[PDB]
Structure 1
Amino acid sequence: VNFPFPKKMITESNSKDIREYLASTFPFEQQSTILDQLKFRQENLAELKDQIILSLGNWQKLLDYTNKLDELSNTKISPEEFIEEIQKVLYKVKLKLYSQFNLSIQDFALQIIHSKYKSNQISQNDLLKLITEDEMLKILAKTKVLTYKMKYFDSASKMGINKYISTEMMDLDWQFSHYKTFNDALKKNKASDSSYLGWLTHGYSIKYGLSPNNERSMFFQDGRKYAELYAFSKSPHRKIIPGEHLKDLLAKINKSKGIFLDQNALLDKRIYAFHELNTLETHFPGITSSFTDDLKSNYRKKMESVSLTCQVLQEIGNIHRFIESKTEYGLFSIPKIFSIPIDYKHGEKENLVSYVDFLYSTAHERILQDNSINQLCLDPLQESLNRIKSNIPV
């Protein structure tokens, strides 16, 4: 079906028309809108050992640490000892089905700290004194991508949104709702470490296949890169007259910038070049400030236009993951008692299909159009618009 543009308008006395339902419904509680409860995971903490006991026969350490995590989940311990208690397994484990339970061991344990932090049980300074540690940075930068790929990638690939997975656009997921603190508080206190951890995170994302390629990544998986990255982060006059091991980086930046500005060449490699490039400026502002070339190519607006496309597709995929469930929510994400049955809900007809029109009108309201942008924005948006209007009634 060639569905046309749903021309609508989100104005005053209309944002609250749907957001009021969205402010209390099961989804969107841990998310936001571009137009702008502890029992839920406690039950998962209870079910943490559903299938571990089935095949304990090698497979004993899983249950051995499972009951320890269950104990530490509900027991009240002072912050200056709770970190030591929980790190006893964090600093112990090293590494098919095993890793599956191993990730749940790490993922559920770390969520406890945020749960106690939002309750003001753990002092902010105490958390600050530990987050700066180097090892847990690479622990989180690994567990986040592993947890995302193990559950959501299987359903994302079928929808065709796998090619539009954005590492930087990951905190908005409802399940990974605890990362706003780790991002914003760390940025406010230690700004450099935020860019450092994002740089580390994208390196594994490249290596684990989030943005796969057959050619090496000359910007990640090497400490000497961050040396210059942090060297220019403190001096405003180092790009004008660069030094050695800095001309090469600029050459590889502008070569990929020209690849992105091209039209005829292959699209998947352009998507690949998008991810690291977008990661570069957000963490390191003023790094590709080609004041001349960007103006005669509308590059500054083009990057934002192609960035908003992935943001729209994320929420579209969320709606698709919500419609069929009414497990695409992902393993160990929603417990069985809190699950969602098959019956159609009356509030969907007034807050979902109408809200899709608002989303597409918001998508098609301020994005520029170009022959390069059309292959990057217009075509995926039209494909998603066609796919979203062929499954709502059914």
Structure 2
Amino acid sequence: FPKKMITESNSKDIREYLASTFPFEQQSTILDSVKSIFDLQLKFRQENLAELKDQIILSLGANWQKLLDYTNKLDELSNTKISPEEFIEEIQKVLYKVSKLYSQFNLSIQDFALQIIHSKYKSNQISQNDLLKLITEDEMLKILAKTKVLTYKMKYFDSASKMGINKYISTEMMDLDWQFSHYKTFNDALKKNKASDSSYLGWLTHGYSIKYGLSPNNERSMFFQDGRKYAELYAFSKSPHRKIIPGEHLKDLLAKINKSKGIFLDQNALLDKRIYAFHELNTLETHFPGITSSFTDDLKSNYRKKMESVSLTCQVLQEIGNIHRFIESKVPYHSSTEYGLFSIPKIFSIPIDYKHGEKENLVSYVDFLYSTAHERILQDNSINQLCLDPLQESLNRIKSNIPVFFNL
């Protein structure tokens, strides 16, 4: 299928549609850097807790009793206007004390508690100081990292695998999804308060992404899952001395960085290895600016532009996956959710029929998304394997399915 080139002009109709249609209104879009362009979450979240409780009650008719107490306690704590001190103390107890079916229910309870913390902050029921007292605890950071990784894996891994974008899942881009908005406010508060906390959280999160099979590799990592390696990275970031003949105690880190850059740039290396090296290098540069930079042997070997290209490709594939799941939800006689367990309650389910002008806006969104990407990626022979090829394959897949779903 030929790729699309329709520039970027007259996008008023699409911009309005995305700002007024669920779930697009609860998220941003890449179509925002081009220089050519609440009060409902409460009732939505309340109904999800009611459905979870109803399923637990039924299973006890066949330690489930313990799960029901926690579920009832969270519902009780959320719909009551009490003192901030009491809310903090009560919620801390629940989170710290927490078969295939049992694990799934257990994780949802943990995630709902964080959603409840999130709703109270936005409604000014708790101040900024009380929030920081909670989330700056090392145990809270480890809970945030593990719950984010595990919840993301539970919901979209099978969907992503059936379409073929699982290899491009990026830890640095899991907070852009509409269901993970609460994590972004917490990260933003931590960055403003103390930049070192956001970097430590990022390092932990990627370590857990590695541990739980999101980034598979035969060889063990060389930067994550080890307190000494974080200590070395921290020591390196705090250095006014820009390595004028540095010491032998930190000269092994540059060799490891160079080996990964060599592997990434090596066009003969296996696809699986290059993407792993990309994910490793992307996190390091985002949270430790300048660690992967080394003048003189970077200007000839175009590196910066290649990283930008792969990062744009990853973002685009995620937005396409969300659009695909959306279109696949408007099918007659559905009675099931495509966004994971306890995602959309029956009361707030997506309407079965198409609203007037929706089809045209969706096709325009798709076309503008593919046309914006092409004007930025690097077209050459050394990289056309991690960027152009997957984008073309995805375009081929989306254009084949759309004419089928729009005809009942």
C-alpha change, 1:244 and 1:39, in structure 2 (3 Å) is farther
Quickly say closer, same or farther: Cα 1:230–1:342, change in 2 above 3 A.
same
Q: 1:12 to 1:213 in 2, by over 3 A?
A: closer
Q: How far does residue 6 in structure 1 lie from its aligned partner after superposition? A: 6.6
Change (3 A) 1:70 1:167: same
* Residues 44 and 335, structure 1, Cα contact 8 Å, conserved in 2: yes
CA contact (8 A) 1:306 1:377 kept: yes
Structure 1 residue 219 and structure 2 residue 223: aligned? yes
- The offset of 1:363, in angstroms, is 0.8
Shift, 1:319, TM fit: 0.4
Distance of 1:161 and 1:49 partners within structure 2: 34
Change (3 A) 1:341 1:293: same
Task: Summarize deviations over 1:73-125 as a string: whole Å, max 9, x none.
Answer: 212222222111111111112xx221111111100011111101111111011
Equivalent pair of 1:6/1:360 in contact (CA under 8 Å): no
Correspondences of 1:161-240 after superposition (within 5 Å): 161-237=165-241, 239-240=243-244
How much has 1:179 moved relative to structure 2? 1.9
Q: Is the 8 A contact 2:175 2:181 kept in 1?
A: yes
Q: Distance in 2 between matches of 1:169 and 1:218?
A: 22
- Residue 349 of structure 1 deviates from its aligned partner by 1.4
Where 2:210 maps in the other structure, the secondary structure is helix
Shift of 1:328: 2.0
C-alpha change, 1:12 and 1:265, in structure 2 (3 Å) is closer
1:332 Cα deviation from its structure 2 partner: 1.3
CA distance in 2, matches of 1:239, 1:44: 55
CA contact (8 A) 1:232 1:238 kept: no
Whether the 8 Å contact between 2:157 and 2:166 is mirrored in structure 1 is yes
Residue 341 of structure 1 deviates from its aligned partner by 4.2
Distance 1:133 1:366 in 2: 41
What RMSD in Å do the two structures reach over aligned CA positions? 1.8
Checking the alignment, whether the CA contact within 8 Å between 1:116 and 1:122 is kept in structure 2 is yes
* Deviation of 1:130 (Å): 2.1
**The 10-residue stretch of structure 1 (275-284 or 341-350) with the greater mean CA deviation from structure 2:** 341-350
Whether the 8 Å contact between 1:79 and 1:121 is mirrored in structure 2 is yes
Aligned CA distance change for structure 1 residues 72 and 284 (closer, same or farther; 3 Å) = same
Deviates more, 1:208-217 or 1:332-341: 332-341
Q: Report which stretch shifted further, 324-333 or 241-250.
A: 241-250
Contact kept? 2:8, 2:368, Cα under 8 Å: no
Q: CA deviation at 1:366?
A: 1.6
Q: Deviations over 1:247-301 (max 9, x none)?
A: 2222111101000001122101111111111000100001011112221111011
8 Å CA contact retained: 1:199, 1:220:
yes
Q: TM-score, normalised by structure 2?
A: 0.91
Q: Choose from 74, 84, 87 the match for 1:82.
A: 87
Contact 1:259 1:270 in 2 (8 A): yes
Once the two structures are TM-superposed, the CA of residue 344 in structure 1 deviates from its matched residue by 3.6
- Greater relative contact order (Cα 8 A, min sep 6): structure 1 or 2? 1
Following superposition, which runs of at least 4 residues in structure 1 exceed 4 angstroms of deviation? 5-13
Residues 104-161 of structure 1: CA deviation (Å, up to 9, x unaligned)? 1100011111101111111011111222110000001000010011111111110101
Residue deviations 1:305-354, cap 9 Å, x none?
11100000000000011011113211111112111244344332121011
Instruction: Pick which of 371-380 and 356-365 moved more.
Output: 371-380
TM-score, scaled relative to structure 1:
0.94
Query: Aligned to 1:297, what secondary structure does the other structure show?
Result: coil
Would the aligned equivalents of 1:45 and 1:73 in 2 still touch at CA under 8 Å? no
Asked if the contact 2:49/2:71 (under 8 Å) is kept, the reply is no
Q: Distance in 1 between matches of 2:328 and 2:85?
A: 45
Matched residue, 2:17: 21
The CA deviation at 1:70 is: 1.1
* Alpha-carbon distance between aligned partners in 2 of 1:81 and 1:88, rounded to the nearest angstrom: 11
Label 1:380 to 1:128 Cα distance change in 2 as closer, same or farther (>3 A).
same
How far did residue 15 of structure 1 move? Answer: 3.1
5+ residue gaps, structure 1: none
Q: Distance in 2 between matches of 1:9 and 1:81?
A: 58
Deviation sequence 1:188-242 (CA, Å, 0-9, x none): 1110010000001100100101111121011111111111211122213254444
Asked if 1 retains the 8 angstrom alpha-carbon contact of 2:316 and 2:369, the reply is yes
Q: After the TM superposition, which of the residue ranges 50-59 and 326-335 deviates more from structure 2?
A: 50-59
Separation of aligned partners in 2, 1:379 and 1:7: 12
How far residue 45 of structure 1 moved from its aligned partner, in angstroms, is 2.6
Q: Distance in 2 between matches of 1:245 and 1:103?
A: 42
Q: What SS does the aligned partner of 2:216 have?
A: coil
Where 2:53 maps in the other structure, the secondary structure is: coil
Structure 2 residue ranges without an equivalent (≥5): 32-40, 331-336
- Is 1:244 matched up with 2:244? no
Closer, same or farther in 2 for the Cα pair 1:359/1:6, shift >3 Å? farther
